[PDB]
Amino acid sequence: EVQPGNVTVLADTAIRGQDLDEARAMEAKRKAEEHISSSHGDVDYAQASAELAKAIAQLRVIELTKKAM
């Protein structure tokens, strides 16, 4: 886009096209028709949420103390 005293290039982040797009769309539709796991990148959250899960688990803690709920 060139205009009076300014020109900007609005770049695509990946090669676009009706062929490549319908490919990504069909994929998105498919992944929804079949609940299936997929890893998010975060490992810091992974092994931490796991340790947290094991450490929290099987504690009779809420029973040992006398708490209302």
Place this chain on the structure above:
Amino acid sequence: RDEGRDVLLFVDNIYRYTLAGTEVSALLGRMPSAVGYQPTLAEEMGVLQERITSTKTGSITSVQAVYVPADDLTDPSPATTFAHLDATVVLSRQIASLGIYPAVDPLDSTSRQLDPLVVGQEHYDTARGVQSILQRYQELKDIIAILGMDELSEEDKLVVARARKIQRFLSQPFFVAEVFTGSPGKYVSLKDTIRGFKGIMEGEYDHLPEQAFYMVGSIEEAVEKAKKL
């Protein structure tokens, strides 16, 4: 009993009887058992407790208030007293500290006759159903306190919600208790008790808030209370 057939026998604190025998056991000159109790605790209880029974000639219905010292259900008096009971309902301070004033712990409280062949299947399944979800809740209680409600699955979320309804539908105002509390008494049919709990568990009365169930008679009272608030 040994004449007329049907008698009721109410006894306040069988513990006070055992406790008396302890104040003496020292002077009677016998060595102390566990926790300073008499070595004859096993028998002193059994003798008296074995006397109360249904004879061929006549039966005896009997309720009795067995005290538990310092809240310790492991304390010998309660521990040994247990075996001598057909039905054993236990009141915990934790459940009272909430506001539920038939302060019965529905988990640690049981009967030998909660049998399907005896009390019908509908009563049984309802009883154990109520027992389960209430226990499943006790497990989730831990993660809730540390990580909050928003961490439960939408299913477990519903488990605690349904449980907390049960937890306070167990409550009801006693007539005798009107004196020191404004709440007028109520009396629930064994028939309704099943209808309500079975009902809540099915997921019928969900929409209603929790307070709707707290301190009321039949379920149709929980409904009407939900209207006022």
